[PDB]
Amino acid sequence: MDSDIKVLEDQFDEIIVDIATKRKQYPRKILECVIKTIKAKQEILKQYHPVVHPLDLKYDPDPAPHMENLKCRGETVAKEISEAMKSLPALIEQGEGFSQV
Amino acid sequence: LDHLKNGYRRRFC
Amino acid sequence: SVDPMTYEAQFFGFTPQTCMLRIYIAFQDYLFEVMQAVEQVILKKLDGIPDCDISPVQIRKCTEKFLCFMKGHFDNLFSKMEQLFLQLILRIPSNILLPEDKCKETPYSEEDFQHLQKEIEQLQEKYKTELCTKQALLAELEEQKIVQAKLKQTLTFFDELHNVGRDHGTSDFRESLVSLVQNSRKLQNIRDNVEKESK
Amino acid sequence: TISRVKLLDTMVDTFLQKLVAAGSYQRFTDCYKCFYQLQPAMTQQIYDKFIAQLQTSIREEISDIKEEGNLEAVLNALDKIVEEGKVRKEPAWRPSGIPEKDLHSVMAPYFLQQRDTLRRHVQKQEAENQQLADAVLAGRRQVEELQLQVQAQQQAWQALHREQRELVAVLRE
Amino acid sequence: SLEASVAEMKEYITKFSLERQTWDQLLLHYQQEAKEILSRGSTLGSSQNEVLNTKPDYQKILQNQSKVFDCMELVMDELQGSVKQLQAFMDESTQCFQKVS
């Protein structure tokens, strides 16, 4: 012992004050780092805000080249049945004009 | 003269 | 036994036992200093002897006697004073918590902590889905505008058709048809009467 | 309280009183009888110088280590920390030797504020999504009712077929 | 007992050794984590999933319009046939009713 106990107690003191220094000042430096890394993470999160997926697609329009064509034939049949409704009862009058004498 | 006690262990019974 | 006084360091930064060792070797050295002083002071006054002489080797072991006594009482008294030192000084009362680690006063458990980490990651993922479903809803509504306007276009065509029917005389075809079949039926009847009176 | 410094000066004072209690001058002479029979004024003078320079050398030593690392200031700061810490009386937390646990306890608050910030972001986007989806459902009921009106007037123009069939029936011999 | 005390001391030396090592490892861990996350930035079960999954087919709707117009076209074809069938009868009726002289 003696000299061996002095060397062993010397290194023991060194490790006590060393682990105490760690216990004190390491959480502050580590804390500084993790604060940086947390600000960095929440910062890179907001950069994802432009997700922008297109989606879209469509069957598109097949417009009105022919739409006005069937509406025009609609005008034709409309006027035709109008004047037919106007001219038929006159033929009814010619009809019952011949039914007596 | 010295011959003084050297040691004084820090943490023992 | 074997108290490392880990928490007594980190505050002082040297540990109390080592400090007491330094104080010990200093005190001991000073005691031996004053004893060396008295021996070499009596020896020079001892040269002032005529008539007879008294040997110095005897006075050396004389000082050694008084010094061994002094080391007994000095050593014991320094032990007691040093344990009082370690009790009322150089000690964190174990009741007190250092300002360095105040956050450890209400400690966040390992389980609450891991729970909160998983919550953090899962909320990052939740934010990440909510934003793209925002974009999905918005995209579906912008897409939905188009079919809304196209259906408004077909409805526009039907209203324009009833308009083009309104002009040229026949706004409601069904009525036109029912009257035209009605008077067609009369004309049929009177026509048969006229053809059967025709001979 | 005694400010911890009057305690240490007090206890080293007691230490000297106890050391000077030993070597009570009688203990100095009764072994030093040779030379004590000659000039007992010189013996007491050198003993007095011995005791004085010993106690003042040792007091100058402790006062030297009071100025070593501002030990007066740090023991006074410890006095303050002891005064402010009183009222708890329960054993305070000590470093358990597991760096992960203590690091959890210190890193906890910043992770809590991180959690709450992200959770309120999610809250905002969630409410906006509720509004946006409500609009989407409104729009799909609008397209539904639109197609309902479209097919309605469509069948309105398909209804003429019966009238035409009774026309052809009237016009058939 | 000197043996027991030196034993406890020679166990503490290794315990505090492992703790120091763990502190250094942990600190450099968070350090390089912060470094990599700070150097990284430079170089669907969501809420209301039903609303997202309830998505009526709009393409089929536009297709249904395109065939609605076809149905309408043949509607007017049948109409424009029935009209001819009518005033053909009107023409023969007015002709045979003027044939009465």
Numbering used by the authors:
A (entry chain N): 104 to 204
B (entry chain P): 6 to 18
C (entry chain A): 2 to 200
D (entry chain B): 31 to 203
E (entry chain D): 203 to 245, 260 to 317
From the paper:
We speculated that the detachment of Head2 from the core of the MIS12C might, at least in part, explain our difficulties in obtaining well-ordered crystals of MIS12C. We therefore generated a deletion construct, referred to as MIS12CΔHead2 (i.e., lacking Head2). MIS12CΔHead2 retained CENP-C binding (see below) and readily crystallized with it in the absence of proteases. The Head1 and Stalk of MIS12CΔHead2 retain the overall organization and relative orientation observed in the crystal of complete MIS12C, except for a small rigid body movement of Head1 relatively to the stalk. In both complexes in the asymmetric unit of the MIS12CΔHead2:CENP-C1-71 crystals, clear electron density is only visible for residues 6–18 of CENP-C, whereas no density for the helical C-terminal segment is visible, probably due to crystal contacts involving MIS12C. A MIS12C construct lacking Head1 (MIS12CΔHead1) did not interact with CENP-C, while MIS12CΔHead2 bound CENP-C like MIS12CWT (even with higher affinity ). Indeed, the MIS12CΔHead2 construct, which also lacks Ser100DSN1 and Ser109DSN1, binds CENP-C in SEC experiments. Indeed, MIS12CΔHead2 bound FAMCENP-C1-21 in fluorescence polarization experiments with a Kd of 2.2 nM, i.e., almost 60-fold more tightly than MIS12CWT. These results argue that segment 100–109 of DSN1 likely binds directly to the CENP-C binding site of MIS12C through an inter-subunit interaction, as depicted schematically in Figure 5C.
Human MIS12C (also known as MIND complex or Mtw1 complex in Saccharomyces cerevisiae) contains the MIS12, PMF1, NSL1, and DSN1 subunits (synonyms are reported in Table S1A). Finally, MIS12C is a binding hub that connects the other two KMN complexes to CCAN through an interaction with CENP-C (Gascoigne et al., 2011, Hori et al., 2013, Hornung et al., 2011, Hornung et al., 2014, Liu et al., 2016, Maskell et al., 2010, Petrovic et al., 2010, Przewloka et al., 2011, Screpanti et al., 2011).
